Structure formats: C-alpha cells, structure tokens
Design a protein around this ligand. Structure first.
Ligand SMILES: O=S1(=O)C=C(c2ccc(O)cc2Cl)C(c2ccc(O)cc2Cl)=C1
Ligand SMILES: O=S1(=O)C=C(c2ccc(O)cc2Cl)C(c2ccc(O)cc2Cl)=C1
Lengths: 9, 235, 231, 9
C-alpha cells in the first residue's frame, strides 16, 4: 500500500 | 486542535498548504498519440497525487484522524481533488484545460483519447461556472478541503462527529469570507448553496472519470499508486 | 416566470401538494423475483415522478428538450432520495413499499445490490440523525431535479429558481428557531448529502446497465430509455 | 420518445 507509506512519513 | 482556529487562520492554513503547479514533460514535437497523451496525463496525475497526500496532511482536522480513515477519505476524493484543482487552474483560460503551464488543451485534443471528450466538456463547463461565479482562491481551498472530508464520511464511530465539526467550521469560514466581500446574508446563503452544488457535479465527473480510467486499465500505462487508488473504487 | 413571484411559504405548499403517492409492490425471494418486484415498482414510480416534475415551480417554464434532459440526468437520484425518505422511521431497513420493507441481507439476493443498499441505509441514518423535515426534503428533491443536469448538454432561469429554493430552505430554518450560524451550517450539511446521493445514483446506474446486459429480467421501455441516457 | 409523451400530457 503506497498511499499508506506516503501518509506515514 | 483545528477546532480552535479562527476563520482567517483557517484560510491562511489552507492557502499556505496549497500544492505547487507541476510541469508536464510535454514535447511540442510529437503531435498526439493516444498512448502518449495518456502517458503525459498519467505521469502528471501521479506526481500530483504525491503532493495531494502531503497536502491532505495539512488540512485542519485531517491529522487528528486515524489511518484507515485518512486512507479512506483520500481513496474516495482523490480524483475529485485533482479535478477541482485542474478546473481552478483553467479559470483564466476559456475553452481550455490547463493540465500544466506547458500543457493547455481544448476539447478537440481531448478527442485523442477514446471517450475522454465527454469528461473534458464537463471539466470545461465547471471552469466556465467558476469564472461566471468569479470563484475566489479563499473559496477554492475551502471547497477542496470540504471535498476531502465529506466525500467519504457516508461510507464508513465518533469520528464522523469530529469531521462534521470541522466541516461546520469550513462552512463558517466561507460565510465569513462572503460577509467580508459585502454580500448580505441572502447572497451569502445563495452563494454558499451555489458553491456546494458544484461539488455534486464534481462528484459526477469523478465517478465518470473513475469508470474511464478502469477502462484504459483493461485496454493497456498507469502508475502503481494510481492503480492502487483505482482499485479502491474497484471497477 | 411565476415561480420567482412565489413566497417561501407558497413555495413549500406548492412542493408539498405536488408530492407523489406511496405505491405498493405486487403480491422468500430469488434474484429474478426480487428484481421483478423492484423493476415493476420503479417503473410505476417513474410515471408519478414525471407528473411531479411538472408541478415543481419553474420546471414548466423550461422547454421540452430541457425538461427531458433534467429528468434523464436526475431520475435515479430522485427515486433514491424518495426511498431514503420513506425509510427514515425504519432504521436498518429500506421501505421500498409499505408491503415491501427490506434489510441488507435481503439485498444480497441480487448480485451487487448490497453495496448500493448500504449506501442507501447510510443516507437514511444521516437524515434521521439530522432530523430532516418534510419541508426540507421536498426542497432537496426539487433542487436535485434542477441542479443535477444543469451543467451538461435558460440556465439563468434555473439558477434563479435554485436560488429561490435556497431562500425557501433558509426561511424554513429561521422558523424553527435556528440561529444564524446554525442556519447556514445546516444548509451546508443538507446540500453535501446531495453529493453522496449523486454518487449512489452513478453506482446504481452501473448496477442496472449490467442487469440489462445479464438479461436476467426484462426492464421497462421507459426504464430502458432513462438508462440509455446515461451512456 | 416515451418521456416526451408523459411530459406532453
Ligand atoms: O481528463 S481527465 O478527467 C483529467 C485527468 C487528470 C490528469 C492529470 C491531472 O493532473 C489531473 C487530472 Cl484531473 C485525467 C487523467 C488522465 C490519465 C490518468 O492516468 C489520470 C487522470 Cl486523473 C483524466
Ligand atoms: O437498490 S437500488 O439502487 C433501488 C432501486 C429502486 C427500485 C425501486 C424504486 O421504487 C426505487 C428504487 Cl430507488 C433499484 C432498482 C432496481 C431495479 C430496477 O429495475 C430499478 C431500480 Cl431503480 C435498485
């Protein structure tokens, strides 16, 4: 889940 | 947290968090192939998504949410947010869509992609409407943030109340702006309604656009992140 | 025109008296049988809606081609907000007809309906939580009729009529003792629901087109005409 | 076609 990671940075 | 903001602080926060206008790698020496034009549009949207995600994190109240929920709201509103951003950029360009400063298209060029001209016209009609209403940037950033928090609440508890509380704050902000332009209550309510009805059309464009992208999927480009947002609305 | 000369109360009364009647369904369920009852009911409800539209103040001022356009674009939204309205005093249930009260489990009989079902149920729960009133409801329904297709395919008239309904919506809220802030907040809350209602309709439109292609049940020729407009 | 007739009556 890419969106997951980008939101988590 | 975000409930403590005043109307002017709400606007400033939203204005300061605005994403940049990215550039297309568009070479004016390759007059249109459906694969290339779609490639240009796909590359641009994918880079715009990255900025949107970091933009969303700066929307007052969004951070106070949990994951799952931030993911959900973005999975629902991402195309609406890209579209209202595209429309807003295109306001000073009648009959044209400014995808990038170097990529300005009309409905004729939109015919290069099968069934894209329909969505084009809808995007253009939306822009014409905003120009007719003389939409303001302060109003634009409110609408865009309304789209982020509203498009997904009805498809999820105790978190909705916080969202509606933030949504009510943005409503107050819009009214605050309209009252500052010497509008009158009657015109304040009227403009407020007119703006919010546009969102219904924006939802409709997004839904149609969503279908169109799922079509180009099983036709064979598309970024990994874009396909991930696309499976959120399934097919 | 004449819809603009109307006062707020006259606008409300006009919309209330224009309200279509609640129809009954025919007669366990299968996919074919449930689709049969729902198709029949929707077909008959459509006839009444078209009648109702002609009683919406300002709608007759439009011209025939434009009336057709608005109705073609908004028909499922109007059916859906009507369904959602009837189901308000029946939590967790959708009142398609008095003799046809269904839940989400029964919506599984038809493939791919349970999703739209849950959205409909969610809208009813939203209406109930906001304590939506009949006068507010009839205003929203006419707004849908006029708004939904106004951007596609004269326009100044509709926008002025739309402004009139906004004035009518606010006037209703002012009577209920709602403050200034509560008024535009509720107004916003109400109009934002139209965005999800639009979403349900588009999702619903997909569901019916596939049922047409699946040929599982023959649909009404009127229903087929309205469904082909969204293509 | 059908929608026309229902509106004209
Ligand atoms: O004409 S449309 O509706 C607009 C877009 C669009 C494109 C770039 C943007 O930066 C913004 C938007 Cl809104 C696309 C589109 C095209 C190809 C894609 O892979 C994805 C999209 Cl979103 C189709
Ligand atoms: O769950 S849903 O989205 C709701 C409907 C519906 C049905 C009857 C109504 O009177 C009102 C509605 Cl809103 C349908 C539907 C089903 C079969 C059809 O041939 C047509 C429709 Cl409109 C599917």
């Amino acid at each position: 889940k890419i969106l997951h990671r980008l939101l988590q940075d | 947290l975000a409930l403590s903001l005043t109307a002017d602080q709400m606007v400033s926060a939203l204005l300061d968090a605005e994403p940049p206008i990215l550039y297309s790698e568009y070479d004016p020496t390759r007059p249109f192939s459906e694969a290339s034009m779609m490639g240009l549009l796909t590359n641009l949207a994918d880079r715009e998504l990255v900025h949107m995600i970091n933009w969303a994190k700066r929307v007052p109240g969004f951070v106070d949410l949990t994951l799952h929920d931030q993911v959900h709201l973005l999975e629902c509103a991402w195309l609406e947010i890209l579209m209202i951003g595209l429309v807003w950029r295109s306001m000073e360009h009648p009959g044209k869509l400014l995808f990038a400063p170097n990529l300005l298209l009309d409905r004729n060029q939109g015919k290069c992609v099968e069934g894209m001209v329909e969505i084009f016209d809808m995007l253009l009609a939306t822009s014409s409407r905003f120009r007719m209403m003389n939409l303001q940037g302060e109003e634009f950033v409110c609408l865009k943030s309304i789209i982020l928090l509203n498009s997904g609440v009805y498809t999820f508890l105790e978190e909705k109340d916080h969202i509606h509380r933030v949504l009510d704050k943005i409503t107050d902000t819009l009214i605050h702006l309209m009252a500052k332009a010497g509008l009158t209550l009657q015109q304040q309510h009227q403009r407020l309604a007119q703006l919010l009805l546009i969102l219904s059309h924006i939802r409709h464009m997004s839904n149609k656009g969503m279908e169109h992208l799922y079509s180009m999927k099983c036709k064979n480009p598309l970024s990994d992140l874009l396909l991930e947002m696309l499976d959120a609305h399934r097919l």
